[PDB]
Design a protein around this nucleic acid. Sequence first.
DNA 1: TCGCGCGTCGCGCG
DNA 2: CCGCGCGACGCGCG
Lengths: 63, 64, 62, 62
Amino acid sequence: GSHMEQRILKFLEELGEGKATTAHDLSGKLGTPKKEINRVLYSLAKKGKLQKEAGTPPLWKIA
Amino acid sequence: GSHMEQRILKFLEELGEGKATTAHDLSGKLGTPKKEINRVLYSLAKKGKLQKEAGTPPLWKIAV
Amino acid sequence: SHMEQRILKFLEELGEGKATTAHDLSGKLGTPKKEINRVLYSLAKKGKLQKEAGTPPLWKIA
Amino acid sequence: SHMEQRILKFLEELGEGKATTAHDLSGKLGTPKKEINRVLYSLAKKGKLQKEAGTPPLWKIA
DNA sequence: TCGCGCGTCGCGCG
DNA sequence: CCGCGCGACGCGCG
């Protein structure tokens, strides 16, 4: 893309370091299906750019 | 309960003025079954403290 | 399950053109109406029961 | 359902007590794996099929 | 230990 | 024309 990766990093940056959010939350606000959201979230995780907090659902933040 | 009633009111107050949220949303940020959250949400509406807006799911905000 | 069996029986002991409500079944088998309704709608899927429109909805055997 | 029938047949031809996987069915029926599992688990709710523990899980006609 | 089926739900109801 | 069955869901999978 060009790029769902950058859009997410912003929503979290604007949210402020140390604050988390769910994929379901990012889905409805970025107008993007939760499916594509998670595959990018986990992609960012494999790049150490994001940190996941286990749970149901999982929480994502910049840290 | 009043404890839960006060927690919900706080959240909406901090959420700014004119903004709304959902029961599913409050459920996660309060660690409480949505079934229970709705009991309190609708009760506060009975007391004229909250207003319910149409939507999917419905949106809730402080009564004006 | 023990519920599906205990509902089918009751409705069978009922007439052919007879139909009852989930509320009547709840206050007859000492069972949460949520459970009764769960089973009823479950049996309606398997064609084992028939639902008649209205409030409350009426239920009978097929 | 037709998809339900194509699966039941395969398992019947496979023998009694025999089991296979979703991946296998997917390839021999030319149907996406997601669709296969939906029907498998669906039939499991109807008591038609039986799921055996494993990875991937094995499926047998109950 | 790639297991994955996964949809919708609005429900407040005593 | 209170009808209401409604649980859990974590899923990213190529």
